[PDB]
């Protein structure tokens, strides 16, 4: 009452599919502009906010 993962034809699961095997540009950043990571204050702030978000759920 289940299906075998290992046997003849499992190799079809591993074929290369070029059009699916890379990320596309859509949804990615539009350019190479510098992106600043969180400052320690900004991080501490975000976690404070999420702490409270959770506290009310």
């Amino acid at each position: 009452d289940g299906e075998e993962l290992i046997g003849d034809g499992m190799e079809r699961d591993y074929r290369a599919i070029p059009e699916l095997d890379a990320y596309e540009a859509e949804g990615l950043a539009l350019d190479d502009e510098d992106v600043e990571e969180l400052t320690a204050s900004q991080r501490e702030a975000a976690e404070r906010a999420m702490r409270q978000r959770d506290r009310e759920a």
Binding site: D13, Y14, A16, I17, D21, Y23, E24, G27, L28
Partner: protein, 78 residues
């Protein structure tokens, strides 16, 4: 075989769709998608190992949803 797990492109679009109802107009660094994909895959592969242990405990070779459920509960998920 290959190190192939989840196809990249559907994974990307999956991430954008989910992100969209939290915030709109978002874009991603490719590495951010890459980060999500690797973590997702490590998460599921590890989970399947725990799941497999739960099946064996019940003297089954066939894993089932209840196995995944036990594993997640013991791992402290909700």
């Amino acid at each position: 075989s290959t190190e192939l797990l989840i196809r990249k492109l559907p994974f990307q679009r999956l991430v954008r769709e989910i992100a969209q109802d939290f915030k709109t107009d978002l874009r991603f660094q490719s590495a951010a998608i890459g980060a999500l994909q690797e973590a997702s895959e490590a998460y599921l592969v590890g989970l399947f190992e725990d799941t497999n242990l739960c099946a064996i405990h019940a003297k089954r070779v066939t894993i089932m949803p209840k196995d995944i459920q036990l594993a997640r509960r013991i791992r402290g998920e909700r």
